[PDB]
Amino acid sequence: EHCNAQMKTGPYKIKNLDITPPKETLQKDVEITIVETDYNENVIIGYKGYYQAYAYNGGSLDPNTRVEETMKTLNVGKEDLLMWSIRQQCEVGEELIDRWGSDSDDCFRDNEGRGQWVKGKELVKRQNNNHFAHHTCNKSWRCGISTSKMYSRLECQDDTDECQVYILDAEGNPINVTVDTVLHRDGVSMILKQKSTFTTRQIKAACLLIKDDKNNPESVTREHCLIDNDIYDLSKNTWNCKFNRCIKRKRAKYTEGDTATKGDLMHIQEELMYENDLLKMNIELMHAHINKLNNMLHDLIVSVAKVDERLIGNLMNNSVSSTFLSDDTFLLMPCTNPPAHTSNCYNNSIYKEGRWSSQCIDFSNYKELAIDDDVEFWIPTIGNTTYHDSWKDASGWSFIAQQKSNLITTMENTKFGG
Amino acid sequence: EHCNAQMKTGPYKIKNLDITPPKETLQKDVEITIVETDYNENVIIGYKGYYQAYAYNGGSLDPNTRVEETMKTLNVGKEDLLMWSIRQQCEVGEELIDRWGSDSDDCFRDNEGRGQWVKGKELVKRQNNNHFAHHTCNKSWRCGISTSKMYSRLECQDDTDECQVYILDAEGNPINVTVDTVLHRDGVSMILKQKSTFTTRQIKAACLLIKDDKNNPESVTREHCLIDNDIYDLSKNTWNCKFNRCIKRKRAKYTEGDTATKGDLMHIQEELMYENDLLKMNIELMHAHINKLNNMLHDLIVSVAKVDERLIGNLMNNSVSSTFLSDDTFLLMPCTNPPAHTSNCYNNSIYKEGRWSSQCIDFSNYKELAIDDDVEFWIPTIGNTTYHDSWKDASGWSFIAQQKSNLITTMENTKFGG
Amino acid sequence: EHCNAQMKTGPYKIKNLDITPPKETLQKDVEITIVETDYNENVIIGYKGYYQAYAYNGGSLDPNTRVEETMKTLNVGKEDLLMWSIRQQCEVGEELIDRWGSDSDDCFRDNEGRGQWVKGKELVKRQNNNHFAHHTCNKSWRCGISTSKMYSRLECQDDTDECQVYILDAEGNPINVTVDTVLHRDGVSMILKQKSTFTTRQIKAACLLIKDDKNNPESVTREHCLIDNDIYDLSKNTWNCKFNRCIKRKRAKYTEGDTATKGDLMHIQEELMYENDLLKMNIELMHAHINKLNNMLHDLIVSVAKVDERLIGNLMNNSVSSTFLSDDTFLLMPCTNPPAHTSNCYNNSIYKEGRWSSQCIDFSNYKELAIDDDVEFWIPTIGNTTYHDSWKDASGWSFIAQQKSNLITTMENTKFGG
Ligand SMILES: [Hg+2]
Ligand SMILES: [Hg+2]
Ligand SMILES: [Hg+2]
Ligand SMILES: [Hg+2]
Ligand SMILES: [Hg+2]
Ligand SMILES: [Hg+2]
Ligand SMILES: [Hg+2]
Ligand SMILES: [Hg+2]
Ligand SMILES: [Hg+2]
Ligand SMILES: [Hg+2]
Ligand SMILES: [Hg+2]
Ligand SMILES: [Hg+2]
Ligand SMILES: [Hg+2]
Ligand SMILES: [Hg+2]
Ligand SMILES: [Hg+2]
């Protein structure tokens, strides 16, 4: 307290800190529509066919000495296909081995394939022509039935809010498979067991809103919403559709079920690493600030303690009286007091410090004065996630792949039907 | 205030809190080089071949009675391959069915395959030998052309900062496919439409730096950098290369495009769950600390309010005067004041409290005194990510797979060419 | 200070803020058992077979004029299979081309395949019957050996804490492949080079514990544990097993190695986006609160500065004296003081302010009074992650796929063995 008076600077006033209105807003009870189908649908897959070798032996002289070979693949019709499913069995015609002479014609009798009921059956590539001056016939049948699964994809229109369940091939393209008409594709016959069925559900959900477009401080740049402890982006108010589900705030190749790459995982991993280090930086940046503030509160204490001998005791929550030596340093002595002071008189005529009989009140029943707000933080439990299969994993498509492969193998091992 | 004097402890001084210099540093304007190619490159894929059955019938007696079968796969040359691409068509020779007698030799006339232009064509495995004392020839042609895509992989050397675009097979290995020479592989002929072209881009980017090696408190253990609202690790100052892009702060199997596993997803999911719970713990740990501090500030208030009757009013931002009963408890009365006091005199001779005519100043124009720093938090918008296809999804490789399969099927259905 | 006395409200007391006991607890030195096997195991894969065409030519008259074709696939036995591995070679019988007449019987001599040692070998589908009144024999051999890899899966029982290493097929099912018995599957013979071996490791690890079930405030709803700078969920105290490793706090299709989808990646991406915006909201929500608190500390300052002229100087850490004009506004003058005051006397009789020779102490050696706690934040380094291959990538299964394909191709190109 010895100062140059000829240098008074001012007038001054303490700069209060900016209280910024939050750009991220929590909105409760946001109305949301969920539309969902079965992950996969039951598809009846059936195939049929025969390999035939009709031959005639007139010796080397005859131009009619030949072995005509055919491998017909047949379609299976709606009613048969259904029957096949019900029965977990498929129907073929009779196996004709070495039917020669006048029996050469058993071959042309049945081209639908009737009378044999098997679990399944594969061709045998049988052929012979060792009956001189005669025709020889061999005709082997193949057969297969499966009620397999194929992946659904739900889709809804923002125009009309109408939805449809698409059935996808191994590559993510929808395919025309219906309940009323058999589809013939990849050498096979396909029909739906069930008309594809969906369902809607209405909810009120908690959404985090973000308004960080400086030009449009009211435009909502991102919205994250809690659907059953799982987070979703619903910023765009178009229908949001993936796999078997569609969500909204009240035909080309689909792509979500494509196989993901290790490389994109690793980037998500780096993003996670980043988030962790981002958490640490900001937490510590906040830590440091508070500590600075804490220390200001210290400078406050030492100053006001020179007048208030019992303050340090209060702060430490233990009754002790302080005696200062400098502004900086001080001493402590133990104390304990009669705490039952509930009125403010005894035989009163301005008695105690800070100056303490209607001007004489008992304060047993008093109320808390709220001069502060507590902050409340919103960090809900998350992580109820679903994993979906890639589109190349459909049980139905591998079934189709299997019979295709089985045919390839049997049709290259020639058999003698004698 | 009744204390044991014989127990003075000290001298004491209030322990200030450690202000830790931040280990995570933000560095602005970090110079960065981006090198990028097309995700995929256009590859002309062409294939050709014939199946031939040259037979002679001299009866069972003749050892020369035989059916010689061959299936040649041919190479397609640079110029033809280009022509094929331009024309979306491929060229084959004439289809020879049942050419016997003196026409047996049509077979050997054309082995290049000229004169027929088709969109594409598959073999027919035709054969016969029913012309006694004569040779019989059948020769069927196959044909295919596609200008498909195959995935690029960029690579740069830290030595010399030279880059190259590699074209990968379905397994992630580079393959020698050039603009000047046709590559013959997997029974097919391949050439590039275009010389592989890249491009560079220089940027200044914001990077988060981390120095958490206790032994080397200056070594930078991790660096995360913002490239167009997407986060990258550039701690190592080697070239960072994935898929079609390379980044740097100014031949074996590649691996990023391998298919990722559900299991590694789930771990990333658990890491996310962890981060969320890590956020909650630390936020609340900070919450609690501040509340403790807030309550200290309360003990301060009650003490200094015994001298300052208008303080509580100021804090609550409403004019009220306080009267204390104990140290703890107090009463309130309403007030409102004339706020236009801009000088500090009236007819002044030490008038108001705290003691308030050159010693008499008007303070209309005053300045804010900055005794505090605001903290500033760095949490930029992220999430502009790219997804890449797995290496088994290249349109070009499935084309090659397709023709391979088509050949397999046709070469096991024998036809009679009579 | 002019107030309506007829409206005293009270008695009041300042509401302290709730200090909430943390629901997320850090527990150190949690005992954990790790069990681990090799990622993959060495599997000896061997295959063998022949294609035979035994024919007889008695002319068109003879019913015995026929070409009997067979393609046997053989099993390879334990000892041979081992020998094959050691030698990187496989054994076949002699190639018989056009052995006719009395040599027709070379065909039936050797059906095991002995005497030829090759790196590998493929069939040639050779056949002829151009020797009148004689049998003709052709028999070609195929051969293949690989010591390939197949993926391990570790599994442990909570009952008995016994573990086993399973060897998986391309679809994630375990297969019965042992050291003592050859397995015959997919037209091939398989045996283990090595008995499958695991190993255990005990650690003490730091775990984050969470108790957020309101009904059971002691139940531990989630536990995240650090295993070598990588985070794991060990809430459930069952064995946790994925791929080749099992962890615990002291046969159907396995699924972790299935291919993950782009769609599930994108959701993880949205979760990350969410976390970032969640970090920002909460950080800023905390920022705002502190600033409010900071400003309270300002109202405190101005009040107590009216009594303490040197306080503002202390806070700003520079010696200056304050003179007030209103309650709000003030002026500053420069100062600097003799700081060596280490006793509290000179020629003392109640000298300085706040009232400052055994009642006369030197304070060179004083101690810091801890009236505060620093908070300590726990954000450990993470991100030592492992990536695993999908189950369709096993070198051993593609080897099996390869020979299968090679056979398909050779068995549809007929050759004349004359
Ligand atoms: Hg005939
Ligand atoms: Hg006969
Ligand atoms: Hg006859
Ligand atoms: Hg990414
Ligand atoms: Hg009293
Ligand atoms: Hg000839
Ligand atoms: Hg003829
Ligand atoms: Hg002739
Ligand atoms: Hg991971
Ligand atoms: Hg006044
Ligand atoms: Hg015979
Ligand atoms: Hg002969
Ligand atoms: Hg002979
Ligand atoms: Hg997800
Ligand atoms: Hg002094």
Swiss-Prot record, chains A, B, C:
GO molecular function terms attached to this record: identical protein binding
UniProt keywords (A-Z) are: Disulfide bond, Fusion of virus membrane with host endosomal membrane, Fusion of virus membrane with host membrane, Glycoprotein, Host cell membrane, Host membrane, Lipoprotein, Membrane, Palmitate, Phosphoprotein, Signal, Transmembrane, Transmembrane helix, Viral envelope protein, Viral penetration into host cytoplasm, Virion, Virus entry into host cell
Where primarily located? Answer: virion
Q: Would you say which domain of life the source belongs to?
A: Viruses
**UniProt similarity note:** Belongs to the baculoviridae gp64 family.
Question: Could you tell me what this protein does?
Answer: Class III viral fusion protein. Envelope phosphoglycoprotein which mediates the fusion of viral and host endosomal membranes leading to virus entry into the host cell. After receptor-mediated internalization of the virus, gp64 undergoes conformational change into a fusion-competent state at low pH, and the nucleocapsid is released into the cytoplasm after cell fusion. May also play role in budding.
The protein in question is named: Major envelope glycoprotein
